[PDB]
Design a protein around this ligand. Structure first.
Ligand SMILES: Cc1ccncc1NC(=O)[C@H](C)c1cccc(C#N)c1
Ligand SMILES: Cc1ccncc1NC(=O)[C@H](C)c1cccc(C#N)c1
Lengths: 304, 304
């Protein structure tokens, strides 16, 4: 009973967080095996950020200029390399708390947990979605760079995001763990446009199924629709076009509730055209898009 | 930038979770030092739950009937005792992962993180508030009993809640770590009424300050009010009466934004009387009451 914006248990990721300092800039690093990963802008001063030449800036640095502190003890840096927008610092000690892990690049519309950190220490954990425009609406202040996003499948942590930047609009941008930015962003202090965002249609449908499972059914109507008709409405309301791939992953929820996907699309169509009329669904007065079909299945079945 | 429903990092609590089995009933236990804490209904069959006599039921049990498994290894039970609605199982081994901890009883309207667990394994973490009627609107399925709520102050985990029961309305009830229920509930399979709930006024005000800090200011108006006038409105909308104690803890937010508490009460008054008019505040179309003034200060300053 009940449905919450649940994050993964952050324990496995907490054991990997370290503080990385280079010059007078300090941020967070991810220590997996004998490598510490962090945003390459750790080597920049505030003035360098205006128009950095990272290759030239990194050439002035040596292994002894990167200070890595894991909790209370100091790690010895025996190598350094830049991969895209991340720095990889080779250390002489493998992290004894390294969980089973993978580096994955998530698709827009997928969700993940963020462990927000400052000075190598965790402050909080929250669940969010990668927006269709490749930004994340996080909660990050200065010093939070190097904080990571992840998913967990039983004992394996799949790291998908590393925080790098706050756009002038207050939304956030970052990279995968190979240092490739999500979206069109660059690690530079320059105004950068994030694309037009849209609502993650499949996620709203998954969340409407979670509402039915937990007893919120007032929005169910006597109508149905077609993919074409629904997509005409989705376009008018800046929702992502629904595809047969989206219908396929909603199948387990359709099977559990007996509500055909296209019948749920007709309920979504009426909510888009009429609004909530002062009512709520799962404690929300808007259509929630940060739960994927997989998240709803996992939460509603109790997967640990 | 940004404001999220952030939970505490759950690492310290994950290291304490164990599985407790007695007969054919399995639930979660909390292993701190050489004691495992769990709901006393672990000793009941489904039929016993109709009208349990816990003293008589516990008399038929011996130390060897309580199976405690911490991850993969079995703990040896050398003592058992019932304290209110919790069972305390003395084990021959102190948990090597015991964090610095306290047992605290929280007041209604306070917030905390829940680490939802099944069979001793963590599935997710979420932040919630203790409702003024002493229920929590969690996300719990069968097997989640023994999952705990907590807060963390630097290195100290203050355990405040242990999950015990799902009411017929789908809301949740539980105890402090001394086994005293929050609210008028009893650990019995009988329909039980939770009081009339109200909105946590001080929390909504704290969240309106968080919105101002992050740029959502459309709801600020040219008006002010008095505690008496505001409380007339709060009563009409089933909001908790605001006291000078509530005003006192909102002071740091009033100081940061320069918006007097009573001026913020006047904005809240207009939002209660007029609604949001199809607009949102911090990504919400309703007035959010699950962030205390302390949570907003902590999140907006980056406390780790
Ligand atoms: C201030 C702040 C708040 C939240 N998240 C990140 C930040 N910090 C930043 O955005 C830093 C100053 C920055 C500036 C320009 C480019 C990059 C990159 N990549 C990083
Ligand atoms: C089914 C379920 C879902 C979520 N949370 C708890 C539960 N489990 C329960 O509420 C169990 C069956 C129960 C029955 C009656 C009294 C107590 C107590 N104390 C416990």
């Amino acid at each position: 009973s009940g449905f919450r914006k649940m994050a993964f248990p952050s324990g496995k990721v907490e054991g990997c967080m370290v503080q990385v300092t280079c010059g007078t800039t300090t941020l967070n690093g991810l220590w997996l095996d004998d490598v510490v990963y962090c945003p390459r802008h750790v080597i920049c001063t505030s003035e360098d950020m205006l128009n950095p030449n990272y290759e030239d800036l990194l050439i002035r640095k040596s292994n002894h200029n990167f200070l890595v502190q894991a909790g209370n003890v100091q790690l010895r840096v025996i190598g350094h390399s830049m991969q895209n927008c991340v720095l990889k610092l080779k250390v002489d000690t493998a992290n004894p708390k390294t969980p089973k892990y993978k580096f994955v690049r998530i698709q827009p519309g997928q969700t993940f947990s963020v462990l927000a950190c400052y000075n190598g220490s965790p402050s909080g954990v929250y669940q969010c979605a990668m927006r269709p425009n490749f930004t994340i609406k996080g909660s990050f202040l200065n010093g939070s760079c190097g904080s990571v996003g992840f998913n967990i499948d039983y004992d394996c942590v799949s790291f998908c995001y590393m925080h790098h930047m706050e756009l002038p609009t207050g939304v956030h941008a970052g990279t995968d763990l190979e240092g490739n930015f999500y979206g069109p962003f660059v690690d530079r202090q320059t105004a950068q446009a994030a694309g037009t965002d849209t609502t993650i249609t499949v996620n709203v449908l998954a969340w409407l199924y979670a509402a039915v499972i937990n007893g919120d059914r007032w929005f169910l109507n006597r109508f149905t629709t077609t993919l074409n008709d629904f997509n005409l409405v989705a376009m008018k309301y800046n929702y992502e076009p629904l595809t047969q791939d989206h219908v396929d992953i909603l199948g387990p929820l359709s099977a559990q509730t007996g509500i055909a996907v296209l019948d749920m699309c007709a309920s979504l169509k009426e909510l888009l055209q009429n609004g909530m009329n002062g009512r709520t669904i799962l404690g929300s007065a808007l259509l929630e898009d940060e739960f994927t079909p997989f998240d709803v299945v996992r939460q509603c079945s109790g997967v640990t």
